[PDB]
Amino acid sequence: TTADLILINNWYVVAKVEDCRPGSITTAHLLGVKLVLWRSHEQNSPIQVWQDYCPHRGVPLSMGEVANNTLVCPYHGWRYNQAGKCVQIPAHPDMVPPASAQAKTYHCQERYGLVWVCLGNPVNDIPSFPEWDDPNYHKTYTKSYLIQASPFRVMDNSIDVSHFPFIHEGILGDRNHAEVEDLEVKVDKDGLTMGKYQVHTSKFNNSTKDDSMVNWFRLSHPLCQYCSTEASEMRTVDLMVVTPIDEDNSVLRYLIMWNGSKTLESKILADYDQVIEEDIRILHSQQPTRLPLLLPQEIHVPSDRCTVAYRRWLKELGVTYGVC
Amino acid sequence: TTADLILINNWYVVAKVEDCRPGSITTAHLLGVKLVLWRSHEQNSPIQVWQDYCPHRGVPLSMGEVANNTLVCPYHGWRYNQAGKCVQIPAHPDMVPPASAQAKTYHCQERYGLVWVCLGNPVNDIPSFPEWDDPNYHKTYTKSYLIQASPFRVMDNSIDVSHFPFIHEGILGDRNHAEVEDLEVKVDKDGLTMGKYQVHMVNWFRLSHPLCQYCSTEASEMRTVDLMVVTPIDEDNSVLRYLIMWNGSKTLESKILADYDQVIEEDIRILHSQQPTRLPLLPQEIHVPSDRCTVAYRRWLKELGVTYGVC
Amino acid sequence: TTADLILINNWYVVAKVEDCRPGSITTAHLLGVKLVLWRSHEQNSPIQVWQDYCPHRGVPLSMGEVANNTLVCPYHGWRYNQAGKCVQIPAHPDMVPPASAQAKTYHCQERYGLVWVCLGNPVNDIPSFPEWDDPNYHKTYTKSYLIQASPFRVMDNSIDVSHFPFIHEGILGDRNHAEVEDLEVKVDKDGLTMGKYQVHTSKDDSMVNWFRLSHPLCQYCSTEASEMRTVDLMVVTPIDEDNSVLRYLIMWNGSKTLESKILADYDQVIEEDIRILHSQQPTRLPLLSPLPQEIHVPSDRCTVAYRRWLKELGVTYGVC
Ligand SMILES: N=C1N[C@H]2[C@H](COC(N)=O)NC(=N)N3CCC[C@]23N1
Ligand SMILES: N=C1N[C@H]2[C@H](COC(N)=O)NC(=N)N3CCC[C@]23N1
Ligand SMILES: N=C1N[C@H]2[C@H](COC(N)=O)NC(=N)N3CCC[C@]23N1
Ligand code: FES
Ligand code: FES
Ligand code: FES
Ligand SMILES: [Cl-]
Ligand SMILES: [Cl-]
Ligand SMILES: [Cl-]
Ligand SMILES: [Cl-]
Ligand SMILES: [Fe+3]
Ligand SMILES: [Fe+3]
Ligand SMILES: [Fe+3]
Structure with missing residues (x-):
């Protein structure tokens, strides 16, 4: 990803909050990275914003599903908690998942009904309104x-x-x-x-003074x-x-x-x-x-x-x- | 082809025998090479599998026609026999075609109802079934x-x-x-x-x-x-x-x-x-x-x- | 245009004259260069052939309109005359356009009902007929x-x-x-x-x-x-x-x-x-081959x- 650090360490809007309902999975693209956004089914659940990539075999996690506050890969069903840590591998259900089975996660804030994402380390504040x-x-x-x-x-x-x-x-x-x-x-x-x-401005309503x-x-x-x-x-x-x-x-x-x-x-x-x-x-x-x-x-x-x-x-x- | 030698010397399915009827011309694509498959109109005629490339001016032979146990290029009518040798140049009908006038041919076997093709030198037989x-x-x-x-x-x-x-x-x-x-x-x-x-x-x-x-x-x-x-x-x-x-x-x-x-x-x-x-x-x-x-x-x-x- | 110099300095046809009505704007492409062709509304007005590029903010001039013997860019309305010099900046209507406000123009000739264009400097005549x-x-x-x-x-x-x-x-x-x-x-x-x-064909049949x-x-x-x-x-x-x-x-x-x-x-x-x-x-x-x-x-x-x-x-x- 060739974006300058000044761009990587800033906040950008990737979605409206109203299009991201509880339990939803959404895709977006930011500075060349594929993102998955997801929320648990609970009311007021936070939005997670991760790279859209399962560490196991590189399947997009956005093709999976949300269940019990985890995002579930569709291929082998590995389950990632809100922090992006794999907490269950169905093929070996009593095995602790490898510590390397971990989604790449990014910073996310909801502000003004918009979903803000920083791919780097936020040097700035979200702009004021x-x-x-x-x-x-x-x-x-x-x-x-x-x-x-x-x-x-x-x-x-x-x-x-x-x-x-x-x-x-x-x-x-x-x-x-x-x-x-x-x-x-x-x-x-x-x-x-x-x-x-x-x-x-061009006049539209002739009964009214020019709305300059x-x-x-x-x-x-x-x-x-x-x-x-x-x-x-x-x-x-x-x-x-x-x-x-x-x-x-x-x-x-x-x-x-x-x-x-x-x-x-x-x-x-x-x-x-x-x-x-x-x-x-x-x-x-x-x-x-x-x-x-x-x-x-x-x-x-x-x-x-x-x-x-x-x-x-x-x-x-x-x-x-x-x-x- | 730029595939590794280990892949070049293996057999791959490229068609079903039922789709290669006598007289027919079909195409396939294997390891980056465009192929033409063709058969004479004789019943039980063999299948030829060649690179889909006329060496006169580079036109696909698959756009041609099968006439009299030969495959005929549509651009200048050069005729290729079942071994891929050009046997007739219509512009110069008395001339013997030069030795380079040769389609690039490949190995082909029918097995299990399928057309198997080896682009190199088969060191294996077709997998058993x-x-x-x-x-x-x-x-x-x-x-x-x-x-x-x-x-x-x-x-x-x-x-x-x-x-x-x-x-x-x-x-x-x-x-x-x-x-x-x-x-x-x-x-x-x-x-x-x-x-x-x-x-x-x-x-x-x-x-x-x-x-x-x-x-x-x-x-x-x-x-x-x-x-x-x-x-x-x-x-x-x-x-x-x-x-x-x-x-x-x-x-x-x-x-x-x-x-x-x-x-x-x-x-x-x-x-x-x-x-x-x-x-x-x-x-x-x-x-x-x-x-x-x-x-x-x-x-x-x-x-x-x-x-x-x-x- | 990575074209060789001997190609750049030759003449080529880019349109029929019947395709270029007075007042029209059409486009062509030659040796990688995008072209705009345009004409005044006067009968038998000459044809201009320019790079399809406004020097101000890079809008294709072909998206503009012919008016009063000028081609007018749609973005900020700059007007270029038949020589491709900007004659009017509407934001500053009393100002003189800088010398750099000039379209990149090409040689054009009508001949045999065809529009001939040379991107460089013509070293040959249009072919004889x-x-x-x-x-x-x-x-x-x-x-x-x-x-x-x-x-x-x-x-x-x-x-x-x-x-x-x-x-x-x-x-x-x-x-x-x-x-x-x-x-x-x-x-x-x-x-x-x-x-x-x-x-x-179908002395003899020949x-x-x-x-x-x-x-x-x-x-x-x-x-x-x-x-x-x-x-x-x-x-x-x-x-x-x-x-x-x-x-x-x-x-x-x-x-x-x-x-x-x-x-x-x-x-x-x-x-x-x-x-x-x-x-x-x-x-x-x-x-x-060598x-x-x-x-x-x-x-x-x-x-x-x-x-x-x-x-x-x-x-x-x-x-x-
Ligand atoms: N952020 C912006 N909103 C727009 C507001 C709303 O009006 C409209 N019609 O969009 N008006 C305006 N003149 N500015 C300058 C550029 C367009 C815009 N910039
Ligand atoms: N050679 C293979 N054929 C397929 C069939 C599909 O079986 C059925 N019943 O559709 N059987 C099977 N065990 N699998 C596993 C993966 C795909 C496949 N491997
Ligand atoms: N300059 C050329 N015009 C074409 C016409 C085609 O003739 C007819 N009757 O359509 N005449 C001709 N001799 N040929 C041969 C190559 C293509 C062409 N060359
Ligand atoms: S690829 Fe995601 S669980 Fe295997
Ligand atoms: S290109 Fe095949 S005969 Fe000329
Ligand atoms: S881009 Fe043409 S006038 Fe501004
Ligand atoms: Cl949930
Ligand atoms: Cl597919
Ligand atoms: Cl035959
Ligand atoms: Cl667009
Ligand atoms: Fe499967
Ligand atoms: Fe021809
Ligand atoms: Fe605007």
């Missing part, structure tokens, strides 16, 4: 988007604001109001922050973005998380929170989906698929300030995976 | 199974008895009778033999060579034997076939075949998912005593010098 | 044929003459007339020429055929039978080392009503060849000369 515990804000989750592009391209595109009047034409501007005001970007001890920024939004966002780590939007009657926040499948593939998910009417959920999710799929069309075709750090090399203009700072930040962090 | 000569036993053939796993993984899985109660629950074991008694396994000059052992019915098997297995199962009222043959397509792909014989009622045939198909499909589900796809010889695999037969098999392949399809 | 301005000749074009074989294999198979009786039986021969007369073949500074020879390649992927073929003459220009697009596009421009001085019969005969013969070409191993064309891979008998004289000519030119792309 201040509105999570605020009862004035409702919450919803997008579907997960599988995207054939580097996770760092996915985050680069989400930090770029100048493309709004073109590929989000009709939602976030139009081709003839495309000028980009000066941008305020900082890379410091809190990571990358984009200062408050006006976005002219003001955005700002912070990245405390390069594959997770906290975004704040103020409209005329409402504040919307989201936690955008990118799962780095490998160097060339990503999963994109949003946790969205807003303090307007709960009835807005359907419209919020449909509007995110329309924006994300427009982005995915560009991401899928971008050349090369990995993000070039500072084919001709990419040109930069003043409105690229944000994405330029992002690329510099990645070089400072020693990122070599998913970039070129 | 005693019940073929016993008219008290009926016979049937499974269909062939194309498996995306190393052939040595396929054979390794078939000798590993401890998985029976877990993935063959109902035909070869009970999840409540999963304990495995002391296995007796012996690797000889006669190959690998597993001693008689009880299945919850007594079973034993012998492999005279790494990819052919003879297996014998005795119930209270009936004996069943089969010859299990693995075609090594290449390092990562196999064809599996069984010749099954039994001395019980002949009406049991469809049940027997159903049982085999169910057991094979359960095995394929596991084989397809196993990693790596090639059989590791001796993270690494762990061994408990009920791995006795599978460890002995891996040691045998290592002793034999097998490097194709392994590790 | 004498009958193009003869008003006694009608013209027609085949469709384009994508072939999963090296373009040198495609060209090799079309100068092979001894296979006509076998895979083209009923159109270019039959198995009762499979014997090949002596072949006149000359390779020199001006390419490969095959002298007149007799093709059997045509006389010759052909010439001034360059290794373009062939001029001439066939005469009973006062009617057919010529064609066969052009192979080298997509990469393992893939190609085949096109024909056909001209003939007989009845106009032969057009659809000519097209069907060409199509049948081409599909018969593709069946062979897709089965051949290796995919790339094997050159000559179970045999290849054997050569006297009727192979023209394909042997072709292989020798390719080594002499220094071709390593698409051969082996």
